[PDB]
Amino acid sequence: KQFGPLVRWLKVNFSEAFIAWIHIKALRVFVESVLRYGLPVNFQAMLLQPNKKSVKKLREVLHELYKHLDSSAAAIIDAPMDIPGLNLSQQEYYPYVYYKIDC
Amino acid sequence: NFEKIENELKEINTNQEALKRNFLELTELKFILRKTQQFFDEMADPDLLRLGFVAGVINRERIPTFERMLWRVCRGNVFLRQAEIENPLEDPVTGDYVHKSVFIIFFQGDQLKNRVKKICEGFRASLYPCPETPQERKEMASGVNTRIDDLQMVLNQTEDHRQRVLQAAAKNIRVWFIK
Amino acid sequence: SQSQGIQQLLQAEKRAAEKVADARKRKARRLKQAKEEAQMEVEQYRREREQEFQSKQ
Amino acid sequence: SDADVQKQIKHMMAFIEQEANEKAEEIDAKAEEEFNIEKGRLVQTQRLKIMEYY
Amino acid sequence: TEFWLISAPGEKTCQQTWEKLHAATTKNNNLAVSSKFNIPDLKVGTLDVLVGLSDELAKLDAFVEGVVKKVAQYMADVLEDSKDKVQENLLASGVDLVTYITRFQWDMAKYPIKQSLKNISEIIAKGVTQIDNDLKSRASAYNNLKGNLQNLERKNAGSLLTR
């Protein structure tokens, strides 16, 4: 009696939950893009899927390309651990705005 | 005689540290007040509430990491400036003479203010209060310029008093010990 | 060299502050204009009901 | 670097511009709303006093 | 599978960035498949408000990561007898999850673009928290029913004393 309704409800609700997930992803992207590149708004993001074992060369070439699109004069090389205070860094950094989806 | 000698020694010894701390704080504040106007040295046409402002002083060898951490936590829009303060100055708490850099940060609102002040305190800098207007700057400059000389005067005279009373004690301590 | 950044920041702050101040002045002026227009419409109703009262009498 | 200085300053001027714009438009909307509702208040109470008078 | 989102910050014009990131990159080598994420041009708040949203949407992403994949976990646990082809049982819409994501766009019908990022994120958070409690209730009810059937198995298990 109850298995069918539960599976139907979960089927419908995962769609809404994930749509909300990617909505939050997009808002995250937009806020971080504005902060990184102050106004006017000029951020038309890319969705990229890396290929088999492509990650190394792919990110090397992406970094080489974005050297000047995002200032290389700061960060990148190293960073201490900023535990003290309200917030601390939990993400890697690069000469670009990068986020991810774990499908 | 022993009670008074030791008690006065204790009291002067304790007060010396506090006076030292406050005098060093006021000295650093005077230096920051000095450099702040140079940082405004572009064009003085004006006769004299959204941008927030802070200033302080750091040790060398921290500057690049500190700057890049500010730039990464508050991306692209925390306006930090700095300059060297020539000749070392004692850290009042750390107790080391070390090379120093006066620094400033400008921000737009409360959220950035929180991050800036917290990262500063985490890096264990020294802020001290700072002005926003030329007359405030002059007020603080005079208030510190009198007080630094006053505290140095009292420090030196009280240290001379230490010297006198300690000589008086040492002249007789051996006989006191034997008795 | 270094000072121009602080100069521009302070002057932009001054400009924004003056703009928002003029906006607040606008708020006050428009509020008082609303007050005056309210009084004039009250006066129009008063005149009309004055005429009706005279007709009644 | 100079590129960082100019880009950061550009961003800050843009953001202070838009902060001033936001406050200006917000105070504009509030002033219009309070214009309407102050008309409402004053007109209604004074007209009701006139109601009692007549 | 995993997908990356890259800023693509204009370069004075959208095309001079997007075309070089996609076509020039893939022609340099086939290291990655490329497409556009179709960001919506939301209304911008104050920089201070945006810095607050920085933390808000920093924590919110980690929160929704948990909630959505908890929905997926309980989905699989309820459908354990046929959880194979899990990606279809999950798929929000389309034929494949990649097919879905490579076509994503801001959806007005669920939430409108006009309101502030504050309010929009708050309503999305309401949705996700309600989803969490709905799981905690309904999946727990199904779990209690399953445990009841296991109690039945215990009633039918062991020696005749236990049975």
UniProtKB/Swiss-Prot annotation, chain A:
Localization: Cytoplasmic vesicle, Secretory vesicle, Synaptic vesicle membrane; Cytoplasmic vesicle, Clathrin-coated vesicle membrane
Tissue: Expressed in brain (at protein level).
Assembly: V-ATPase is a heteromultimeric enzyme made up of two complexes: the ATP-hydrolytic V1 complex and the proton translocation V0 complex. The V1 complex consists of three catalytic AB heterodimers that form a heterohexamer, three peripheral stalks each consisting of EG heterodimers, one central rotor including subunits D and F, and the regulatory subunits C and H. The proton translocation complex V0 consists of the proton transport subunit a, a ring of proteolipid subunits c9c'', rotary subunit d, subunits e and f, and the accessory subunits ATP6AP1/Ac45 and ATP6AP2/PRR.
Family: Belongs to the V-ATPase C subunit family.
Biological role stated in the UniProt entry: Subunit of the V1 complex of vacuolar(H+)-ATPase (V-ATPase), a multisubunit enzyme composed of a peripheral complex (V1) that hydrolyzes ATP and a membrane integral complex (V0) that translocates protons. V-ATPase is responsible for acidifying and maintaining the pH of intracellular compartments and in some cell types, is targeted to the plasma membrane, where it is responsible for acidifying the extracellular environment. Subunit C is necessary for the assembly of the catalytic sector of the enzyme and is likely to have a specific function in its catalytic activity.
Record-given protein name: V-type proton ATPase subunit C 1
Organism classification: Eukaryota, Metazoa, Chordata, Craniata, Vertebrata
Residues of the full protein shown: 274 to 376 of 382
Swiss-Prot record, chain B:
Modified residues (Phosphothreonine): T133
Subcellular location: Cytoplasmic vesicle, Clathrin-coated vesicle membrane; Cytoplasmic vesicle, Secretory vesicle, Synaptic vesicle membrane; Melanosome
Domain of life: Eukaryota
Job description of the protein: Subunit of the V0 complex of vacuolar(H+)-ATPase (V-ATPase), a multisubunit enzyme composed of a peripheral complex (V1) that hydrolyzes ATP and a membrane integral complex (V0) that translocates protons. V-ATPase is responsible for the acidification of various organelles, such as lysosomes, endosomes, the trans-Golgi network, and secretory granules, including synaptic vesicles. In certain cell types, can be exported to the plasma membrane, where it is involved in the acidification of the extracellular environment. Required for assembly and activity of the vacuolar ATPase.
Family: Belongs to the V-ATPase 116 kDa subunit family.
Subunit details: V-ATPase is a heteromultimeric enzyme made up of two complexes: the ATP-hydrolytic V1 complex and the proton translocation V0 complex. The V1 complex consists of three catalytic AB heterodimers that form a heterohexamer, three peripheral stalks each consisting of EG heterodimers, one central rotor including subunits D and F, and the regulatory subunits C and H. The proton translocation complex V0 consists of the proton transport subunit a, a ring of proteolipid subunits c9c'', rotary subunit d, subunits e and f, and the accessory subunits ATP6AP1/Ac45 and ATP6AP2/PRR. Interacts with SPAAR.
The name this protein goes by in its record: V-type proton ATPase 116 kDa subunit a 1
Originating species: Rattus norvegicus (Rat)
Full protein stretch here: 100 to 296 of 838
From Swiss-Prot, chain D:
Segments forming a coiled coil: none
Location in the cell: Apical cell membrane; Cytoplasmic vesicle, Secretory vesicle, Synaptic vesicle membrane; Cytoplasmic vesicle, Clathrin-coated vesicle membrane
Residues recorded with modification Phosphotyrosine: Y53
Tissue distribution of the protein: Expressed in brain (at protein level).
Function (record text): Subunit of the V1 complex of vacuolar(H+)-ATPase (V-ATPase), a multisubunit enzyme composed of a peripheral complex (V1) that hydrolyzes ATP and a membrane integral complex (V0) that translocates protons. V-ATPase is responsible for acidifying and maintaining the pH of intracellular compartments and in some cell types, is targeted to the plasma membrane, where it is responsible for acidifying the extracellular environment.
Family: Belongs to the V-ATPase E subunit family.
Quaternary data: V-ATPase is a heteromultimeric enzyme made up of two complexes: the ATP-hydrolytic V1 complex and the proton translocation V0 complex. The V1 complex consists of three catalytic AB heterodimers that form a heterohexamer, three peripheral stalks each consisting of EG heterodimers, one central rotor including subunits D and F, and the regulatory subunits C and H. The proton translocation complex V0 consists of the proton transport subunit a, a ring of proteolipid subunits c9c'', rotary subunit d, subunits e and f, and the accessory subunits ATP6AP1/Ac45 and ATP6AP2/PRR.
Protein name, per record: V-type proton ATPase subunit E 1
Organism the protein comes from: Rattus norvegicus (Rat)
Full protein segment contained here: 4 to 57 of 226
